[model samples]
Target: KVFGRCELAAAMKRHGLDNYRGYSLGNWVCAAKFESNFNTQATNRNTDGSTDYGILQINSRWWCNDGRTPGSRNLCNIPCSALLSSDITASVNCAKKIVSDGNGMNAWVAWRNRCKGTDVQAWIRGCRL
Candidate 1:
């Protein structure tokens, strides 16, 4: 139910998102827009039967367990639901760990497809951060 990109920008700034996890804030914003449209409770299924949950659209195949699945990596050790919250602090932490563990922003398909090299100035427009 989030409605403000400016608000998100402010929050990200507060969370040190400009260069967090070795990525630009524009990259983060671009990825989030494509992945979940800023929806706090977004979820989608991949063609391979895996699910992507939350704003980051984390894959259930390797990162988090879907609970219904028999085998899960659950690398973050947090529920998929946690990623779907408006707070997103836990998800942010997990994303940091994911990138720090060597995945980088390449861990997200949306980032690879949509945000890798585009001029992202528009994303951080009013914030100017």
Candidate 2:
């Protein structure tokens, strides 16, 4: 566990992610909600045999390796475990890179399946930004 939505937003704002790199705070906030419910220790095994990492649920198949150690990737060159830190620097960094690489939050199943075109303000509701 790390933070609530409101607290996460503040941290993201500190990282300049409130409106960073052409992405919306609403989208970012929503992604984090579904990705891991803001839990840094969150992980899940995929049917493909790859595991998703951290708050962003980055995939080991391409984003990082999780053969239970530091791994490789086509982007965001960091260990899968690095993302599980309570510090979200690595998760945000990798998410920013992924968005910059043209995937945006589409790289995350949660965002693609539940956020886009929806009333995303719900994600940040009652949370003062």
Candidate 3:
């Protein structure tokens, strides 16, 4: 039940985001690729030396308050672990909420609009996703 590109794509499809304009799979892919290489269990240290956790690279301190503590299953709270779990439907919905609520994906749209046809890595570097 490990998740991969196709699983992620299916998750995105369930969220009505199979297209870039409506959801930006390319951007999402690029972000996940660069940020964590699509590793749902990825974790890293923030600029402040604090730990960030999960896929989509959500900051554990910012989102979950404790870097070691697991996130909630509810999408409204810190739901990084849930989104990284085998529950694709819940994961995708949680991720959609996380990105939309944080205004992260809007930056993707802006990047798509302004940086279309450019190298995706360069675009991602400039994009605050």
Candidate 4:
């Protein structure tokens, strides 16, 4: 599912991402906008030949196992296919791992380059939550 902006924000909040690790709801929403434009099935091939999966672009090299990325750690202990589901349970769970695993919000270059040190609140300005 390709979520609307407010729709995605609401989902993230319901999933417990609101300030989950010092990052606000806006930060999560902004990261999603730049990473996948709220599309649940979004995927991209990285320069390292690893693939990124789902809305937040979780990487196959470390986060999820796609069975094709060589030496995948599967630190998230989930299949890359799990990230593609519209339910977003796996995506949200994996995202928590990424944030809590040391890099925090810097895990995504999209967030670091655009969402960080910026007023991300505008991303959810009218979302009312």
C-alpha lDDT of all candidate models, in order:
0.78, 0.79, 0.51, 0.93
Off by over 4 Å in 1: none
Deviation from native of the Cα of residue 6 in model 4, angstroms: 0.6
Q: What is the lDDT of residue 49 in candidate 3?
A: 54
Alpha carbon deviation, residue 14, candidate 1 (Å) = 2.1
lDDT of 3 by residue, 1-129 (tens): 434655555565566654534555655655555555667776676556545455565555444444354442333364445545544454345456656665656433333454345464332343232
Candidate with more favorable, higher lDDT: 1 or 4: 4
Could you say which candidate leads in lDDT? Answer: 4
**What's the lDDT for residue 81 in model 1?**
79
Report how far off residue 11 is in candidate 3 (Å): 2.4
Name the 10 consecutive residues with the lowest summed lDDT in model 3: 120-129
Which whole-number lDDT from 0 to 100 does residue 7 have in model 1? 70
Predicted candidate 2 versus true structure: per-residue lDDT over 5-105, tens digit per residue: 88887777777776666667777888888888888899988876778888888888777756643343546788889989988898888777777777666
Clashes of each: 0, 0, 0, 0
Q: Which residue pairs of candidate 4 clash?
A: none
Tens digits of per-residue lDDT, candidate 4, 16-42, equal 998998999999999999999999999
lDDT of 4: 0.93
Q: Which clashing pairs does model 1 show?
A: none
Report the candidate with higher lDDT, 1 versus 2: 2
Candidate 1, residues 15-128, lDDT tens digits: the string is: 766788668787888888898887768999887778888877887777777785456588888888788888978667777777777768988878898988898768887774
- Candidate 1: residue 126 lDDT (0-100): 75
Candidate 4 C-alpha error for residue 3, in Å: 0.6
